[PDB]
Design a protein around this motif. Structure first.
Motif, mmCIF file in Angstrom:
data_model
loop_
_atom_site.group_PDB
_atom_site.id
_atom_site.type_symbol
_atom_site.label_atom_id
_atom_site.label_comp_id
_atom_site.label_asym_id
_atom_site.label_seq_id
_atom_site.Cartn_x
_atom_site.Cartn_y
_atom_site.Cartn_z
ATOM 1 N N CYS A 59 -42.014 -126.523 -7.394
ATOM 2 C CA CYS A 59 -43.332 -127.076 -7.730
ATOM 3 C C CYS A 59 -43.530 -128.482 -7.186
ATOM 4 O O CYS A 59 -42.654 -129.337 -7.279
ATOM 5 N N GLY A 60 -44.711 -128.758 -6.668
ATOM 6 C CA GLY A 60 -45.059 -130.137 -6.419
ATOM 7 C C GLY A 60 -44.358 -130.666 -5.198
ATOM 8 O O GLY A 60 -44.330 -130.008 -4.135
ATOM 9 N N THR A 61 -43.801 -131.868 -5.338
ATOM 10 C CA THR A 61 -43.197 -132.550 -4.192
ATOM 11 C C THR A 61 -42.018 -131.679 -3.704
ATOM 12 O O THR A 61 -41.766 -131.596 -2.479
ATOM 13 N N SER A 62 -41.349 -131.001 -4.650
ATOM 14 C CA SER A 62 -40.304 -130.029 -4.326
ATOM 15 C C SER A 62 -40.703 -128.815 -3.489
ATOM 16 O O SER A 62 -39.905 -128.340 -2.671
ATOM 17 N N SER B 180 -35.434 -128.703 -6.961
ATOM 18 C CA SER B 180 -35.920 -129.445 -8.124
ATOM 19 C C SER B 180 -35.222 -130.767 -8.397
ATOM 20 O O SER B 180 -34.012 -130.860 -8.267
ATOM 21 N N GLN B 181 -35.979 -131.790 -8.784
ATOM 22 C CA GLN B 181 -35.345 -133.035 -9.177
ATOM 23 C C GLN B 181 -34.733 -132.965 -10.561
ATOM 24 O O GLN B 181 -33.697 -133.541 -10.776
ATOM 25 N N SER B 182 -35.365 -132.297 -11.508
ATOM 26 C CA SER B 182 -35.011 -132.490 -12.922
ATOM 27 C C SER B 182 -34.174 -131.336 -13.377
ATOM 28 O O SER B 182 -33.422 -131.445 -14.367
ATOM 29 N N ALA C 46 -46.700 -136.270 -15.155
ATOM 30 C CA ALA C 46 -45.469 -136.171 -15.919
ATOM 31 C C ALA C 46 -44.227 -136.167 -15.019
ATOM 32 O O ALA C 46 -44.212 -135.522 -13.947
ATOM 33 N N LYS C 47 -43.182 -136.875 -15.459
ATOM 34 C CA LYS C 47 -41.891 -136.817 -14.788
ATOM 35 C C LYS C 47 -41.435 -135.364 -14.504
ATOM 36 O O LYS C 47 -41.125 -135.046 -13.348
ATOM 37 N N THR D 34 -37.979 -127.811 -14.777
ATOM 38 C CA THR D 34 -39.342 -127.405 -14.479
ATOM 39 C C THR D 34 -39.560 -125.951 -14.896
ATOM 40 O O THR D 34 -39.075 -125.005 -14.243
ATOM 41 N N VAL E 17 -42.628 -141.726 -11.471
ATOM 42 C CA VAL E 17 -43.098 -140.408 -11.876
ATOM 43 C C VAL E 17 -43.313 -139.482 -10.683
ATOM 44 O O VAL E 17 -43.057 -138.286 -10.781
ATOM 45 N N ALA E 18 -43.670 -140.040 -9.540
ATOM 46 C CA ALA E 18 -43.749 -139.236 -8.335
ATOM 47 C C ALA E 18 -42.435 -139.409 -7.610
ATOM 48 O O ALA E 18 -41.759 -140.421 -7.794
ATOM 49 N N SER E 19 -42.063 -138.464 -6.750
ATOM 50 C CA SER E 19 -40.752 -138.566 -6.097
ATOM 51 C C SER E 19 -40.720 -139.046 -4.659
ATOM 52 O O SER E 19 -41.567 -138.748 -3.796
HETATM 53 N N1 LIG Z 1 -44.235 -135.636 -11.381
HETATM 54 C C1 LIG Z 1 -43.385 -134.603 -10.885
HETATM 55 C C2 LIG Z 1 -43.123 -134.592 -9.401
HETATM 56 O O1 LIG Z 1 -42.804 -135.929 -8.944
HETATM 57 C C3 LIG Z 1 -42.548 -133.333 -8.734
HETATM 58 O O2 LIG Z 1 -42.876 -133.105 -7.380
HETATM 59 C C4 LIG Z 1 -42.842 -132.042 -9.470
HETATM 60 C C5 LIG Z 1 -41.671 -131.060 -9.548
HETATM 61 O O3 LIG Z 1 -40.676 -131.454 -10.487
HETATM 62 P P1 LIG Z 1 -39.108 -131.128 -10.196
HETATM 63 O O4 LIG Z 1 -38.676 -131.649 -8.756
HETATM 64 O O5 LIG Z 1 -38.412 -131.940 -11.366
HETATM 65 O O6 LIG Z 1 -38.899 -129.535 -10.227
HETATM 66 O O7 LIG Z 1 -43.336 -132.151 -10.793
HETATM 67 C C6 LIG Z 1 -43.703 -133.298 -11.536
HETATM 68 O O8 LIG Z 1 -45.115 -133.227 -11.736
#
Ligand SMILES: N[C@@H]1[C@@H](O)[C@H](O)[C@@H](COP(=O)(O)O)O[C@@H]1O
Length: 366
Positions: free
Chosen positions: A58-61, A105-107, A360-361, A110, A157-159
């Protein structure tokens, strides 16, 4: 903890990219090859049985993945498919012969991806590599293989560093698979060279920093933008657009550069700058020509290009010169000016860079 000399975590995170990338290469590079035997004594006939990749985040990932799809398909010759986690988890998908499940994924928390993996268990997935940055959590634990990108915690919060490091690991994996497949080994070393170049190529961009602070002014009071990118640079347009949406609250939207003339052209005026990312010459001539088509509504082309391209600024096409880099890490390299650009707009605008509004983080909760 301590931001150090920095105004915002995100800033620090951007300036840490050179190190963070070193760490992602701590003992993965060794004898000028790629070493992923840090992955169980098992690992390799698994990874050599693979004749298709499904990436899922999702997202930046998803952005980073979107990038790596280009690589794989052309470098390692292995079919690659990328999908938004949620899209996957709510469709009857047609599994591929010996698909590997990479979830980025960063976290590693997700929900949408976490779930995208859990759906894959029961689907016929050869196995599950979770590239990710937080030590031991849902996405890690529940996967067969992990590649912890190790960039330290990312508090913004953004990566930023999270993204680049994912792309480095993507690039290693591209490398490891290319040889474990029989492919003329000149390929792996290219990736490697490029990979050990990379950290100091990032510090190069970073010094060309002031030049971006300049350009930001052009965008600080706009509410539209169109980012353009072709092949591997397109997903960099994706990330660049996203960063602008994210921390400057500007409505930046990314686009296949092939596709400008199929719509958004109609939109361009003085309030919606176009930005192309790292065009070649034949691309420029197309975009340059497009943008003329709208000189009268006052539209501008902003081009980040190789200083080596010898591109020349017209009154409405503005070249922003970047140092030369190796074709293969270009995608990763052209991301920093876009991050810095979002960052400076945000600074001038005065928006909450570290916690942008409504964002959201990670989205853990349903
Ligand atoms: N604010 C974050 C992002 O910075 C990221 O791109 C995305 C995916 O999260 P993750 O890499 O933890 O799976 O979701 C969140 O909204």
């Amino acid at each position: 903890g301590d931001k150090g000399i920095y105004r915002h975590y995100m800033q620090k995170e951007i300036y840490e990219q050179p190190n963070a990338i070193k760490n992602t290469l701590t003992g993965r590079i060794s004898h000028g090859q790629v070493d992923l035997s840090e992955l169980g004594p098992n690992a390799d006939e698994l990874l050599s049985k693979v004749e298709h990749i499904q990436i899922l985040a999702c997202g930046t990932s998803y952005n980073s993945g979107m990038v790596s799809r280009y690589w794989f398909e052309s470098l390692a010759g292995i079919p690659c498919d990328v999908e938004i986690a949620s899209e996957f988890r709510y469709r009857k998908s047609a599994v591929r012969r010996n698909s590997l499940m990479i979830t980025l994924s960063q976290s590693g928390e997700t929900a949408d991806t976490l779930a995208g993996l859990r759906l894959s268990k029961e689907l016929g997935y050869l196995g599950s590599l979770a590239i990710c940055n937080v030590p031991g959590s849902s996405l890690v634990r529940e996967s067969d293989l992990a590649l912890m990108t190790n960039a330290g915690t990312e508090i913004g919060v953004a990566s930023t560093k999270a993204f680049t490091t994912q792309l480095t690991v993507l690039l290693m994996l591209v490398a490891k698979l290319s040889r474990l497949k029989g492919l003329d080994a000149s390929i792996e070393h290219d990736i490697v060279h490029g990979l050990q170049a990379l950290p100091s190529r990032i510090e190069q961009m970073l010094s060309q920093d002031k030049r971006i602070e300049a350009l930001a002014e052009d965008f600080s009071d706009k509410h539209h933008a169109l980012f353009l990118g072709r092949g591997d640079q397109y997903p960099i347009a994706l990330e660049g657009a996203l960063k602008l949406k994210e921390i400057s609250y500007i409505h930046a939207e990314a686009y296949a550069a092939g596709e400008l003339k199929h719509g958004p052209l109609a939109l361009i005026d003085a309030d919606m700058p176009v930005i192309v990312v790292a065009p070649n010459n034949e691309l420029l001539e197309k975009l340059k020509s497009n943008i003329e088509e709208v000189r009268a509504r006052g539209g501008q082309l902003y081009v980040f290009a190789d200083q080596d391209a010898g591109f020349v600024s017209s009154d409405n096409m503005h070249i922003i010169e970047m140092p030369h880099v190796e074709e293969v890490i270009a995608p990763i390299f052209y991301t920093v000016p876009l991050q810095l650009l979002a960052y400076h707009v945000a600074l001038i605008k005065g928006t909450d860079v570290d916690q942008p509004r409504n964002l959201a983080k990670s989205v853990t909760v349903e």
